[PDB]
Structures are given as C-alpha cells and as structure tokens.
From a paper:
The first structural representative of the domain of unknown function [name] family, also known as Pfam family [name], comprises a lipocalin-like fold with domain duplication. The NE1406 gene of [name], an obligate chemolithoautotroph, encodes a protein with a molecular weight of 40.1 kDa (residues 1–356) and a calculated isoelectric point of 5.0. NE1406 adopts a lipocalin-like fold with domain duplication. The finding of the calycin signature in the N-­terminal domain, combined with remote sequence similarity to two other protein families (PF07143 and PF08622) implicated in isoprenoid metabolism and the oxidative stress response, support an involvement in lipid metabolism.
Numbering used by the authors: 24 to 74, 83 to 351
Write the structure that this text describes.
Amino acid sequence: LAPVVPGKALEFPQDFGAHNDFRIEWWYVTGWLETPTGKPLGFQITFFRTASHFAPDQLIIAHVALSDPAIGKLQHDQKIARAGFDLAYARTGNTDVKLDDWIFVRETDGRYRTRIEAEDFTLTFILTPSQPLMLQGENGFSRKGPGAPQASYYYSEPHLQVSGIINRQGEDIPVTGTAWLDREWSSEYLDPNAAGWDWISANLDDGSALMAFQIRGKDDSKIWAYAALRDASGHTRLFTPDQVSFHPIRTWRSARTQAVYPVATRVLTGETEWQITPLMDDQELDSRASAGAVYWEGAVTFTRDGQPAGRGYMELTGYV
C-alpha cells in the first residue's frame, strides 16, 4: 500500500525492522571470509518479500551461495514460502526474517545472527557493525529511474565484522571476515523496460565504503545509475546518473545458461576509476525453479585509480 516519497526521515532502531506495509523489501548480505588456513571464500544471502491455507498471496524468496575457488562454481540453494499464513514457518517481522529453518535476526545490541542450512553447506554467523549505517540517496530516499514513483528507501551497513562457523562435508570450520548489508523497501519494482541491473559494493581497506549501480534498458541504454562513497572522514559523496558508468574489461559465458557477463569491469564514479576483478568467473546462481532468476553473485576485489583498495561483491541480473 505505502508509497516511497521524499522528505521521510528514517528512524532507528525502528527502520531496522520489516516494513510490512510496503509491497517489496530486501535484506541482502554479501561478504568475504577467511578460514583457519588463510583461504578466502565469498558468500551471500538474500531475502526478498513481495505482496489462505495454500494460495501464494504474500511471498518470501531467499537464496544463498558460497564461492570457493577450489570448486570453481557456486554452491547455492534457494527457497520460497508463502508468508502471512504460518508466522512460525515464514515471516518478516520486527527483529527477524525466517523462511523454514533459514533465519536472519537482529539482536538488540545491533549484531546480526544468521543460520542458513543449505544442501552442501551451513552458515552460522554473527555480523557485528563497526561503523554508523550508511543512508543511500537523499537521506535514505534513493531514486532508481526517471519516473517520480521510481524510488526505494535504502540504507546499508558496511564493514560488518564476521565471526562464526561454516559446516561443509559434515565438518565445522570457524571463519572471520567482513560483510555488507543492504536494506531496501519500496512499493514499485524497477520499470519493466529494464533488462536488469548491475550492482557493486566495496569495503575499502582504509575504512571507506562504496556502493554503485546501473539500470540497463532492453535497448542497452542506461535507464539510471547511482553511486555513493563514504570516505574515511565519514563524508558521503553522491554521484548522479551522468557521473556513473560501466566499462567491461573481460566477459565470461556460462555453459549452463549461455549468458555472457562482464565479470571484470571498470566503473567510473566522477573522475575516479574502480577496477573489479572476480574471485572466480563462474559465480552464476540459477534460482528460476524457486521462482527466482539467473543472477551472477560474485565476490570481487577492487583497485582504485590503479591501486589495491578493497573487497566486496558484484551482482549482475538480466543477462539470460
């Protein structure tokens, strides 16, 4: 029901909780891990809600992945449930999100705990904030297209410290890491002339946080674009669509879907050039059989004007 309009200030801790009066809501976690041997792994977790004893009226959709270069492709799992019916089974509420056993919870102290038991791995993590949260756009009002209604309320928690345990092959391993949380809600999806989006975020080594995206038209026009850099002084610089562009360095073709992705790319935010290198090429996640789509969810490293800068994720949609 509820529209996204400017001049509405976010308030915390209230706006950590679900926004069940809106049509759509996202909880998106991306990060890098380190095992006891020093080996890196990437992971991501998505929950997405959109709006009777069996009828699919309100829905919670989720997917998870682990990126291990030793495997060379994702290990992933994906689920969807009807929400509103059995809050014990599937719900988005004041402190958590739950789909079957998959759960994501915010503690009173601000720490996130999550247990995600998938087919080939389990993630049991604590994600501990280290910085103030980062409002996107204009104090959380973040535009995603030229139309007046084409906007989201949107913030991020960058530089989440990761602790906890991954189970794989029935073997518990403790990990450390750093992660990023996006929180977005709206009553309108992207314009349907959009083929898809490209999104990146980066936990930069100096403490800075970067997020950017573009919306791709089916005609290969740039429907919209955005970026925000919060520097080590805590100042956020915002970039207009004019100032953000994407420039592939290298493409990879999926043998599963035949889609062709810019897995390595250069992203310009004003006069600053960020280069994105993938941990591995095949980070494609096909969730179509759980009412999803084919996404590239890949852990990537960033350089800035040619120097090492940090680590993060890149998500690419609408390439099939």
